[PDB]
Amino acid sequence: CSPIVPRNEWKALASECAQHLSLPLRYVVVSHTAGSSCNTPASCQQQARNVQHYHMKTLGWCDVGYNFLIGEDGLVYEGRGWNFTGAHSGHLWNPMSIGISFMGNYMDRVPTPQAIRAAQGLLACGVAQGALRSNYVLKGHRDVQRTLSPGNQLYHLIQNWPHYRSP
């Protein structure tokens, strides 16, 4: 697989989540956090902690919502991971998708190429390792929830990715 920064490495609080995903999944949903971006390991580790803190302490969720987070440092940050149901795309989508989120707001610009590569590698690993059906469907957050996520420019980008379709 491609490299993922493990939870302990970004100093994540422990998960309190219990719900497991039933693999393999038919969907990936790409979001943006609409929060701050980051472009070094140090700042992106802190940004992952910020998102987690928001989700757990402010919102009361059992863990950071996303299965994975993508930094503009070019690294993937382990969130709930491949096996645990996320909280990213609404109650009906959570159990049937992997939610990956780019840290930042991509309404007006795209993530840097190292971020795009990291996300694409992650999905390729997801397919290789059996988390995702070989023919999975890629969706933008806005395709399944009321939101502009993952941002106009990033949305236009992913509409051209393999596995994108519709809606």
mmCIF file of C-alpha atoms in Angstrom:
data_model
loop_
_atom_site.group_PDB
_atom_site.id
_atom_site.type_symbol
_atom_site.label_atom_id
_atom_site.label_comp_id
_atom_site.label_asym_id
_atom_site.label_seq_id
_atom_site.Cartn_x
_atom_site.Cartn_y
_atom_site.Cartn_z
ATOM 1 C CA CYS A 1 0.000 0.000 0.000
ATOM 2 C CA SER A 2 0.963 3.645 -0.204
ATOM 3 C CA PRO A 3 2.028 5.384 2.987
ATOM 4 C CA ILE A 4 -0.530 6.507 5.523
ATOM 5 C CA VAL A 5 0.335 8.496 8.587
ATOM 6 C CA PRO A 6 -0.974 6.325 11.426
ATOM 7 C CA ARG A 7 -3.208 7.843 14.099
ATOM 8 C CA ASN A 8 -0.574 7.649 16.787
ATOM 9 C CA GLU A 9 1.850 9.543 14.606
ATOM 10 C CA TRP A 10 -0.408 12.551 14.315
ATOM 11 C CA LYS A 11 -1.158 12.134 18.043
ATOM 12 C CA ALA A 12 -4.869 11.512 17.548
ATOM 13 C CA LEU A 13 -7.161 11.061 20.515
ATOM 14 C CA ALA A 14 -8.304 7.438 20.755
ATOM 15 C CA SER A 15 -11.436 6.489 18.813
ATOM 16 C CA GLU A 16 -14.597 5.743 20.775
ATOM 17 C CA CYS A 17 -16.316 4.331 17.677
ATOM 18 C CA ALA A 18 -17.698 0.787 17.610
ATOM 19 C CA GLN A 19 -19.424 0.431 14.214
ATOM 20 C CA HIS A 20 -17.562 -1.530 11.536
ATOM 21 C CA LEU A 21 -18.039 -1.163 7.791
ATOM 22 C CA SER A 22 -19.178 -4.146 5.792
ATOM 23 C CA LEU A 23 -16.560 -4.319 3.006
ATOM 24 C CA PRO A 24 -16.132 -4.118 0.123
ATOM 25 C CA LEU A 25 -17.870 -0.779 -0.394
ATOM 26 C CA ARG A 26 -19.447 0.508 -3.584
ATOM 27 C CA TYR A 27 -18.721 4.200 -3.083
ATOM 28 C CA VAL A 28 -16.141 6.813 -2.232
ATOM 29 C CA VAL A 29 -17.296 10.325 -1.310
ATOM 30 C CA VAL A 30 -14.753 13.123 -1.676
ATOM 31 C CA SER A 31 -15.206 16.155 0.557
ATOM 32 C CA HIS A 32 -13.277 19.174 1.725
ATOM 33 C CA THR A 33 -13.131 20.162 5.377
ATOM 34 C CA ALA A 34 -13.796 23.783 4.477
ATOM 35 C CA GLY A 35 -11.333 24.486 7.298
ATOM 36 C CA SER A 36 -7.646 25.475 7.142
ATOM 37 C CA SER A 37 -5.206 23.952 4.747
ATOM 38 C CA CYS A 38 -1.680 22.827 5.554
ATOM 39 C CA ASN A 39 1.486 22.052 3.576
ATOM 40 C CA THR A 40 4.043 20.494 5.936
ATOM 41 C CA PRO A 41 3.933 17.335 8.042
ATOM 42 C CA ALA A 42 4.068 19.442 11.213
ATOM 43 C CA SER A 43 1.169 21.728 10.201
ATOM 44 C CA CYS A 44 -0.889 18.899 8.718
ATOM 45 C CA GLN A 45 -0.537 16.746 11.850
ATOM 46 C CA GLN A 46 -1.817 19.771 13.789
ATOM 47 C CA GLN A 47 -4.602 20.312 11.276
ATOM 48 C CA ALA A 48 -5.724 16.681 11.597
ATOM 49 C CA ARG A 49 -5.823 17.209 15.381
ATOM 50 C CA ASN A 50 -7.852 20.378 14.870
ATOM 51 C CA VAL A 51 -10.434 18.575 12.769
ATOM 52 C CA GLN A 52 -10.593 15.725 15.266
ATOM 53 C CA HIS A 53 -10.975 18.116 18.162
ATOM 54 C CA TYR A 54 -13.822 19.853 16.370
ATOM 55 C CA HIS A 55 -15.570 16.548 15.626
ATOM 56 C CA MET A 56 -15.092 14.976 19.049
ATOM 57 C CA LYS A 57 -15.104 17.853 21.536
ATOM 58 C CA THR A 58 -17.405 20.391 19.872
ATOM 59 C CA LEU A 59 -19.680 18.033 17.951
ATOM 60 C CA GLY A 60 -19.499 15.061 20.352
ATOM 61 C CA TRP A 61 -18.699 12.399 17.725
ATOM 62 C CA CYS A 62 -16.860 9.207 18.544
ATOM 63 C CA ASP A 63 -13.840 10.153 16.372
ATOM 64 C CA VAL A 64 -12.773 12.417 13.534
ATOM 65 C CA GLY A 65 -15.556 11.844 10.962
ATOM 66 C CA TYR A 66 -13.532 11.058 7.878
ATOM 67 C CA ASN A 67 -12.048 7.688 7.029
ATOM 68 C CA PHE A 68 -8.951 9.525 5.748
ATOM 69 C CA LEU A 69 -7.785 13.108 5.505
ATOM 70 C CA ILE A 70 -5.521 14.441 2.753
ATOM 71 C CA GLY A 71 -2.968 17.184 3.398
ATOM 72 C CA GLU A 72 -1.276 19.479 0.901
ATOM 73 C CA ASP A 73 1.964 18.150 2.402
ATOM 74 C CA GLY A 74 1.185 15.201 0.125
ATOM 75 C CA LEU A 75 0.474 12.879 3.068
ATOM 76 C CA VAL A 76 -2.618 10.814 3.914
ATOM 77 C CA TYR A 77 -3.733 10.942 7.552
ATOM 78 C CA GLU A 78 -5.497 7.903 8.963
ATOM 79 C CA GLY A 79 -8.945 8.864 10.285
ATOM 80 C CA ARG A 80 -11.477 6.127 11.026
ATOM 81 C CA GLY A 81 -9.602 4.035 8.441
ATOM 82 C CA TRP A 82 -10.894 1.353 6.090
ATOM 83 C CA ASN A 83 -12.797 -0.646 8.712
ATOM 84 C CA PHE A 84 -14.883 1.763 10.771
ATOM 85 C CA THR A 85 -18.014 3.558 9.694
ATOM 86 C CA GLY A 86 -17.344 7.252 9.156
ATOM 87 C CA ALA A 87 -19.395 10.361 9.883
ATOM 88 C CA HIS A 88 -18.958 12.416 6.745
ATOM 89 C CA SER A 89 -21.777 12.011 4.239
ATOM 90 C CA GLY A 90 -25.071 11.516 6.054
ATOM 91 C CA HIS A 91 -26.541 8.507 7.898
ATOM 92 C CA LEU A 92 -27.347 6.565 4.734
ATOM 93 C CA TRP A 93 -24.025 7.126 2.982
ATOM 94 C CA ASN A 94 -21.710 6.580 5.948
ATOM 95 C CA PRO A 95 -22.189 2.791 6.053
ATOM 96 C CA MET A 96 -21.740 2.345 2.317
ATOM 97 C CA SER A 97 -18.820 4.614 1.511
ATOM 98 C CA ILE A 98 -15.263 5.582 2.346
ATOM 99 C CA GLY A 99 -15.151 9.317 3.042
ATOM 100 C CA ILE A 100 -11.911 11.070 2.168
ATOM 101 C CA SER A 101 -11.521 14.759 2.878
ATOM 102 C CA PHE A 102 -9.045 17.299 1.632
ATOM 103 C CA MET A 103 -8.056 19.597 4.497
ATOM 104 C CA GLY A 104 -8.859 23.123 3.270
ATOM 105 C CA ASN A 105 -11.407 24.989 1.130
ATOM 106 C CA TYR A 106 -11.282 24.246 -2.615
ATOM 107 C CA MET A 107 -14.055 26.523 -3.892
ATOM 108 C CA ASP A 108 -11.582 28.740 -5.708
ATOM 109 C CA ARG A 109 -8.463 26.624 -6.221
ATOM 110 C CA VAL A 110 -7.464 22.976 -6.489
ATOM 111 C CA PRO A 111 -5.303 21.056 -3.982
ATOM 112 C CA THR A 112 -1.636 20.844 -5.005
ATOM 113 C CA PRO A 113 -0.593 17.894 -7.151
ATOM 114 C CA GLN A 114 1.027 16.030 -4.252
ATOM 115 C CA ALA A 115 -2.356 16.082 -2.497
ATOM 116 C CA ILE A 116 -4.187 14.808 -5.588
ATOM 117 C CA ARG A 117 -1.600 12.019 -5.994
ATOM 118 C CA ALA A 118 -1.969 10.992 -2.368
ATOM 119 C CA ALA A 119 -5.741 10.732 -2.708
ATOM 120 C CA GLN A 120 -5.499 8.783 -5.932
ATOM 121 C CA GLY A 121 -2.950 6.378 -4.470
ATOM 122 C CA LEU A 122 -5.172 5.820 -1.476
ATOM 123 C CA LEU A 123 -8.130 4.856 -3.632
ATOM 124 C CA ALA A 124 -5.971 2.574 -5.766
ATOM 125 C CA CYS A 125 -4.869 0.864 -2.547
ATOM 126 C CA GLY A 126 -8.499 0.667 -1.440
ATOM 127 C CA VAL A 127 -9.309 -1.273 -4.620
ATOM 128 C CA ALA A 128 -6.161 -3.402 -4.525
ATOM 129 C CA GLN A 129 -6.748 -4.466 -0.907
ATOM 130 C CA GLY A 130 -10.470 -5.130 -1.082
ATOM 131 C CA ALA A 131 -11.939 -2.136 0.756
ATOM 132 C CA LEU A 132 -13.527 -0.865 -2.439
ATOM 133 C CA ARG A 133 -15.189 -2.771 -5.266
ATOM 134 C CA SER A 134 -12.992 -2.753 -8.352
ATOM 135 C CA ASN A 135 -15.736 -0.819 -10.136
ATOM 136 C CA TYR A 136 -16.643 1.510 -7.247
ATOM 137 C CA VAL A 137 -18.464 4.795 -7.866
ATOM 138 C CA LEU A 138 -16.781 8.071 -6.915
ATOM 139 C CA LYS A 139 -19.129 10.832 -5.709
ATOM 140 C CA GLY A 140 -18.560 14.396 -4.571
ATOM 141 C CA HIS A 141 -19.882 15.294 -1.111
ATOM 142 C CA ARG A 142 -22.345 17.671 -2.783
ATOM 143 C CA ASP A 143 -23.714 14.753 -4.855
ATOM 144 C CA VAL A 144 -25.068 13.096 -1.687
ATOM 145 C CA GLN A 145 -25.546 15.950 0.855
ATOM 146 C CA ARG A 146 -26.613 19.601 0.974
ATOM 147 C CA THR A 147 -23.247 21.319 0.706
ATOM 148 C CA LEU A 148 -20.803 22.900 -1.764
ATOM 149 C CA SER A 149 -18.128 20.501 -0.492
ATOM 150 C CA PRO A 150 -15.697 19.533 -1.912
ATOM 151 C CA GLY A 151 -15.583 23.050 -3.419
ATOM 152 C CA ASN A 152 -16.273 24.150 -6.984
ATOM 153 C CA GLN A 153 -12.743 23.629 -8.310
ATOM 154 C CA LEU A 154 -12.032 20.321 -6.590
ATOM 155 C CA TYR A 155 -15.479 19.060 -7.620
ATOM 156 C CA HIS A 156 -14.698 19.867 -11.266
ATOM 157 C CA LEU A 157 -11.431 17.988 -10.879
ATOM 158 C CA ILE A 158 -12.963 14.782 -9.492
ATOM 159 C CA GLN A 159 -15.728 14.752 -12.114
ATOM 160 C CA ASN A 160 -12.870 13.718 -14.412
ATOM 161 C CA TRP A 161 -11.465 10.988 -12.156
ATOM 162 C CA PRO A 162 -11.944 7.332 -12.989
ATOM 163 C CA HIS A 163 -14.959 5.942 -11.208
ATOM 164 C CA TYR A 164 -16.759 9.281 -11.340
ATOM 165 C CA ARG A 165 -20.272 9.048 -12.771
ATOM 166 C CA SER A 166 -23.322 11.386 -12.899
ATOM 167 C CA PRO A 167 -25.105 12.258 -10.784
#
